[PDB]
Structure formats: C-alpha cells, structure tokens
Motif scaffolding. Structure first.
Motif, short mmCIF file in Angstrom:
data_model
loop_
_atom_site.label_atom_id
_atom_site.label_comp_id
_atom_site.label_asym_id
_atom_site.label_seq_id
_atom_site.Cartn_x
_atom_site.Cartn_y
_atom_site.Cartn_z
N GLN A 43 0.79 -1.23 0.00
CA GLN A 43 0.00 0.00 0.00
C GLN A 43 0.83 1.29 0.00
OE1 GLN A 43 0.18 -2.34 2.36
NE2 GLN A 43 -1.10 -1.69 4.12
N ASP A 44 2.09 1.16 0.42
CA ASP A 44 3.05 2.27 0.36
C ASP A 44 3.81 2.33 -0.95
OD1 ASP A 44 2.30 3.02 3.02
OD2 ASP A 44 3.83 1.67 3.87
N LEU A 45 4.08 1.16 -1.50
CA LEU A 45 4.91 1.10 -2.71
C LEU A 45 4.09 1.27 -4.00
CD1 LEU A 45 7.07 -2.02 -1.66
CD2 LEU A 45 7.94 0.36 -1.96
N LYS A 72 6.16 7.00 -10.65
CA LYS A 72 7.17 8.06 -10.59
C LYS A 72 8.55 7.55 -10.21
CE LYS A 72 4.44 12.26 -9.07
NZ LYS A 72 4.49 13.01 -7.73
N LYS A 73 8.64 6.57 -9.31
CA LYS A 73 9.92 6.10 -8.83
C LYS A 73 10.44 4.93 -9.64
CE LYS A 73 12.42 4.71 -4.48
NZ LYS A 73 12.32 4.69 -2.98
N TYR A 74 9.56 4.02 -10.04
CA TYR A 74 9.96 2.81 -10.79
C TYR A 74 9.63 2.85 -12.29
CZ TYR A 74 10.86 1.29 -6.10
OH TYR A 74 11.33 1.23 -4.81
N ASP A 75 9.18 4.01 -12.78
CA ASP A 75 8.96 4.24 -14.23
C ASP A 75 8.01 3.21 -14.88
OD1 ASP A 75 9.46 5.93 -16.59
OD2 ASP A 75 10.80 4.27 -17.31
N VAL A 76 7.02 2.80 -14.11
CA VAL A 76 5.99 1.97 -14.63
C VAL A 76 4.92 2.83 -15.32
CG1 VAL A 76 4.08 0.43 -14.03
CG2 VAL A 76 6.41 0.24 -12.84
N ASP A 77 4.41 2.36 -16.45
CA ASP A 77 3.20 2.93 -17.08
C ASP A 77 1.98 2.14 -16.59
OD1 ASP A 77 1.25 4.16 -18.65
OD2 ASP A 77 1.98 3.26 -20.54
N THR A 78 1.70 0.99 -17.18
CA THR A 78 0.69 0.11 -16.71
C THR A 78 1.25 -1.32 -16.61
OG1 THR A 78 -0.15 -0.29 -18.92
CG2 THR A 78 -1.24 1.50 -17.64
N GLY A 131 -3.95 4.25 -11.56
CA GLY A 131 -3.81 4.19 -13.01
C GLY A 131 -2.89 3.13 -13.54
N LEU A 132 -2.71 2.06 -12.78
CA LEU A 132 -1.73 1.00 -13.12
C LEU A 132 -2.38 -0.13 -13.90
CD1 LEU A 132 0.12 1.20 -9.72
CD2 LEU A 132 1.25 1.50 -12.04
N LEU A 133 -3.69 -0.21 -14.00
CA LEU A 133 -4.38 -1.26 -14.70
C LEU A 133 -4.78 -0.69 -16.09
CD1 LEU A 133 -6.81 -2.56 -11.91
CD2 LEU A 133 -4.44 -3.25 -12.40
N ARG A 134 -4.72 -1.54 -17.09
CA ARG A 134 -5.16 -1.18 -18.43
C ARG A 134 -6.15 -2.26 -18.90
NH1 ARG A 134 -3.37 -5.46 -21.45
NH2 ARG A 134 -1.19 -6.11 -21.21
N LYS A 135 -6.87 -2.00 -19.98
CA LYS A 135 -7.73 -3.03 -20.57
C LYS A 135 -6.87 -4.24 -20.89
CE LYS A 135 -11.21 0.01 -22.57
NZ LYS A 135 -10.55 1.31 -22.35
#
Ligand SMILES: O=C(CSCCNC(=O)c1cc(-c2ccc(F)cc2)cc(O)c1O)c1ccc(O)c(O)c1
Ligand SMILES: [Cl-]
Ligand SMILES: [Cl-]
Ligand SMILES: [Mg+2]
Length: 213
Positions: A118-120, A126-132, A156-160
């Motif tokens: 829940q913290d990560l 922003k820190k780990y450069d993930v899009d989805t 915003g980490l989930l995509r279709k």
C-alpha cells in the motif's frame, strides 16, 4: 534457523545454480518430505505457468514473495527483456527471496522491493517508471487483496486486459475480493480449481481480467 532459511539451504545444496526448474523441484521436494511451507506449489504452479505462457506479460507485479518460489516460477517463463517486480513486506522473507533468485540466475529479471504494498504501489509510476501492468499476482495477506486491487486502479496501473491472478481464493480464502471481482462489470473472471500446496485440500486461483472503467 528458520524454516525459510532451511528451504534456501536445501535449494543451494540440492539444485543446480542457474537452473530454475531444479530450484522449483528442490523446494517442492523439501516441502513434501520435510516441512510444509506456503509456496504456491506445483499443482497451482502448473496453472500459473499456463497463464503466463498464454499472456507473455512484459511487466508483472507480484504482491507477496515469501521465499521466491512464485517469482522463480514466473520469471523463468518471461521473454527476454520482460520484468517482474515483487513486493515483500517481511525483510527476512525479502532476503530469502533475493538469494533464491540469485541462485536461480534470475536476478536480472526481477526486482524485489522490501516494503508494504500500500506504500509502494503509489510510487510505481514516478519512482519505478511503470506505465501500466500486464499482470498482477496476488499472494500476500488475504485481507489485502481487495484494498490493493482498488489502489492499483486508483493509481492508473491497470489497463484493458491486465490479468489479475489471485492465490488462495478458497484456503485461506479471500471472500471480499472474490465477491467484488465476480460482481464487477470491470472484471471478467475465471476460477481454476486446484489444491492447497503440498496438501490434499481443495484450493483455487481466480483470474480476473480488467476491462477498464
Ligand atoms: O506480509 C507478510 C505475510 S504475507 C503471507 C501471505 N500468504 C499466506 O498467508 C498464505 C497462507 C496459506 C495457508 C496457511 C495456513 C493454512 F492452514 C493453509 C494455508 C497458504 C498460502 O498459499 C498463502 O499464500 C508478513 C509481513 C510481516 C511479517 O512480520 C510477517 O511475518 C509476514
Ligand atoms: Cl510462492
Ligand atoms: Cl503441490
Ligand atoms: Mg499463497
């Protein structure tokens, strides 16, 4: 020593460095012959393998590493350049997992983050450069499956098409998560009946494919 230290030592002494299959076999032998442990195990592990192969995810998030069994299982089947991030709140488990991955030769594919999901999760973009995320494996505290799924969405980490795959939906069970995803028009769900690791007790995995808002 602890059970997790014992399992790591057994792998180091009964498996081949850089051979992930031998690592999995060693852990499964130890946990069948010596002492049970909460690894996903071979029965459910074969269903995980079938899912990974179907989707060939480029970026996988795992919530809960334990000793690294599932991380080895998944990471050995990822395509070149694909990556796994695993979140482990217990520092002792994180250390075992890192050493298990190092022994398996999988360290360049996996990043083991020691902290609370829940913290990560809010730091991933922003820190780990993930899009989805292409896939999420849920195997942490069972009361955290639902809040962390809703947090992934918020962030915003989930995509279709993002695949959620949840362990232990029967034993110990995750009743709020299961009801939620099965009732939501934003998920398409499939139940894979199986067995609790190393036991003649029914368990299962749930796959829930995110469909957008
Ligand atoms: O976050 C953690 C622990 S997450 C482990 C979740 N997983 C399970 O509990 C889990 C449990 C069972 C299972 C257990 C007893 C049974 F009788 C039957 C089944 C099976 C599974 O496959 C599991 O995945 C953490 C943090 C800080 C700490 O100090 C710490 O000790 C631990
Ligand atoms: Cl595991
Ligand atoms: Cl098993
Ligand atoms: Mg589990």
């Amino acid at each position: 020593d602890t059970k997790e230290q014992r399992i790591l030592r057994y792998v180091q002494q009964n498996a081949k460095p850089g051979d992930p299959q031998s690592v999995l076999e060693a852990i499964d032998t130890y946990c069948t012959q010596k002492e049970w442990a909460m690894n996903v195990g071979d029965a459910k592990g074969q269903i995980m393998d079938a899912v990974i192969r179907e989707y060939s995810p480029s970026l996988v998030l795992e919530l809960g590493a334990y000793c690294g069994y599932s991380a080895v299982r998944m990471a050995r089947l990822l395509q070149p350049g694909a990556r796994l991030l695993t979140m482990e709140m217990n520092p002792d488990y994180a250390a075992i997992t890192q050493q298990m991955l190092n022994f398996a030769g999988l360290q360049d594919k996996v990043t083991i983050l020691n902290g609370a999901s829940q913290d990560l999760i809010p730091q991933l973009k922003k820190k780990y450069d993930v899009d989805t995320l292409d896939m999420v494996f849920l195997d942490h505290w069972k009361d955290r499956y639902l809040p962390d799924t809703l947090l992934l969405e918020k962030c915003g980490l989930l995509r279709k098409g993002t695949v959620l795959l949840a362990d232990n939906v029967i034993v110990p069970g995750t009743p709020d998560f299961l009801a939620y995803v099965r009732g939501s028009s934003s998920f398409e769900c499939t139940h894979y009946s199986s067995y609790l690791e190393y036991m003649k007790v029914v368990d299962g995995l749930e796959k829930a494919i995110y469909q957008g808002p």
